């Protein structure tokens, strides 16, 4: 079984897997929405409270399912827990992050697509100072590209290029996932986590000698920075915290796991797992942070920042950014800087996202790495056309498998590791063979705070969400819920010829 032959390139991979789109894409924009720095002291606690023990959690039951040969929640949920019904609640393992695969690297091959476009000066060119003038150009680019509907009817029609890219982007994910885990992610992770931080630290530089009548990057800062009490009572900016935390982390996703299940048996998983989140946050606070909305900020000020970020989640890094930069000298070069970063950042996520599948079919229906690697691309590629045609369809999925989906999963996989797989035992396998032991204090925070934590939120989540779905929407999202259950359902099946060829082999010794 393939285990990393590096603890750099371990924790590299690990920080490629935590460190991406959600970065510098999804945090500037959440941390816009809810006050800026009011969002900062809800994130802090989920960060210590959830983030942190979760993190850890996932690490062991990786390393502890790899052990035995299996790397993915089927598995690992029935090892821990002997019920058929574990491995039911495993399939979610494989399902939430393979249904995020499928829109994620295609957001992922987007920014390729404006990387390839903005170096090679095929950019929109604004007229030499109003903000609407300067940013339709490049909302018509964005629209253009993806091809959004001139109609009523809820058809996307993405340009030849957009469809051209994504292929080129599902090549290159394979590419880099059939050499394996050891010659594939880790020596990809190496020279891409170099090159990201390098990437990002350029932008923020330049992002800060950004200055405007409207204001400077340092106003950005402030705002950012700065904390509100006020904010921190309503039960929003809780959510959207945690939710944060968890897509950040990668928690939830089961892909952690599967990471972790190529850790040596007694190899440090406690430090290890320390210093990637640590690496994630420091890009995703100190980097993510300082670009997206401190640019925003000095050329039009706090308040319309924050209408960009509640506009949309692609506005401020696909319209606004770019259309900020183009005014600057050099901007489409700085444009393709970002961009860039974007697809590395993306890149090194979506690996990891497609991983779980590949390790399942290799771990329980023993095929091999190229057969595993192509066919789960064929499934990813072909479900992605979905996300490309139907509009809507992609916040569908992003709801159900990378919002909703993920805390249920969290909160599930540690009631079975430490609730019903018994407390002491999961402390052993977490602390067993660190390089340090993890404060005693967290014991009693995974044992209790954390999932009591995350139960009262899925609950006032469930109280003023739930009326939502289903009540009133367009009856278009049902196609992409009809296709998403029919993978739960086909995720099912291949479990089911799991334990059956199993049994097979077992009858056969
Ligand atoms: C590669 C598998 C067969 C092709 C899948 C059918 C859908 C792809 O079709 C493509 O869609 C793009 C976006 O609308 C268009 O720009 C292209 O002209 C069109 O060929
Ligand atoms: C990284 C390599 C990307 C190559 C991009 C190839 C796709 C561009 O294809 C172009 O699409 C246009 C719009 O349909 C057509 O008008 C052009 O004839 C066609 O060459
Ligand atoms: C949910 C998956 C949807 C796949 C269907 C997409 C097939 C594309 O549909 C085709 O697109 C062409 C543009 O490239 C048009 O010229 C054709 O009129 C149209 O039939
Ligand atoms: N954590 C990634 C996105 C992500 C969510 N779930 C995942 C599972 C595996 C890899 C990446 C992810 C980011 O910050 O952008
Ligand atoms: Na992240
Ligand atoms: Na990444």
Redesign the pocket.
């Known amino acids: 079984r393939e285990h990393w032959a590096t603890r750099l390139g371990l924790i590299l991979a690990m920080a490629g897997n935590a460190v991406g789109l959600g970065n510098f894409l999804r945090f500037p924009v959440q941390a816009a929405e809810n006050g800026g720095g009011a969002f900062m002291i809800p994130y802090i606690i989920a960060f210590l409270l959830v983030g942190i023990p979760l993190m850890w959690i996932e690490w062991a039951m990786g390393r502890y399912g790899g052990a035995q040969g299996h790397g993915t929640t089927p598995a690992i949920f029935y090892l821990l827990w002997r019920n058929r019904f574990a491995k039911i609640l495993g399939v979610f393992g494989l399902w939430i992050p393979l249904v995020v695969a499928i829109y994620y690297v295609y957001i992922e091959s987007w920014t390729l697509g404006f990387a ?1 476009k903005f170096l090679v000066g095929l950019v929109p060119e604004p007229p030499p100072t109003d903000p609407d003038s300067i940013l339709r150009p490049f909302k018509e680019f964005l629209y253009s590209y993806i091809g959004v509907p001139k109609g009523d009817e809820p058809i996307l029609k993405p ?3 957009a469809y ?2 994504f292929l ?1 982007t599902m090549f290159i994910n394979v590419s880099i996932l059939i050499r394996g885990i050891s010659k594939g992610i880790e020596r990809f992770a190496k020279i891409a986590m170099p090159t990201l931080f390098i990437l990002a630290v350029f932008l923020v530089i330049r992002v800060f000698l950004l200055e405007t009548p409207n204001g400077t990057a340092a106003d950005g800062l402030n705002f950012l920075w700065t904390p509100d009490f006020e904010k921190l009572k309503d039960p929003g900016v809780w959510i959207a915290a945690v939710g944060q935390i968890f897509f950040t982390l990668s928690l939830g996703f089961g892909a952690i796991i599967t990471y972790a299940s190529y850790v040596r048996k007694d190899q440090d998983i406690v430090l290890s797992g320390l210093t990637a989140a640590t690496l994630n946050e420091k890009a995703e606070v100190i980097l993510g942070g300082s670009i997206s909305i401190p640019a925003a900020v000095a050329f039009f000020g706090v308040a319309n920042a924050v209408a960009i970020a509640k506009a949309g989640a692609f506005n401020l890094g696909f319209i606004t950014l770019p259309a900020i930069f183009s005014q600057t000298a050099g901007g489409t070069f700085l444009g393709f800087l970002w961009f860039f970063l974007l697809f590395f950042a993306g890149l090194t996520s979506s690996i990891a996202q497609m991983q779980p599948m590949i390790a399942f079919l290799e771990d329980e229906l023993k095929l091999s790495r190229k057969h595993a690697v192509l066919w789960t691309a064929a499934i990813v590629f072909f479900s992605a056309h979905l996300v490309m045609f139907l509009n809507k369809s992609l916040d569908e999925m992003d709801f159900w498998a990378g919002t909703i989906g993920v805390v249920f999963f969290g909160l599930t996989e540690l009631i079975i590791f430490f609730w019903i797989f018994g407390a002491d035992k999961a402390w052993e396998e977490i602390n067993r063979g660190g390089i340090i032991k993890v404060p005693r204090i967290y014991y009693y925070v995974m044992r209790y705070i954390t999932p009591a934590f995350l139960a009262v939120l899925l609950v006032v989540w469930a109280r003023e969400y739930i009326p939502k779905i289903m009540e009133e929407t367009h009856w278009t999202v049902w196609i992409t819920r009809f296709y998403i259950i029919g993978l739960f359902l086909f995720l099912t099946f291949l479990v089911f010829l799991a334990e059956r060829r199993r049994n097979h082999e077992s009858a056969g010794t």
Do not use: G, N
Request: net charge neutral; no cysteine.
């Open positions: 390839i340009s030849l290029f051209i890219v080129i």
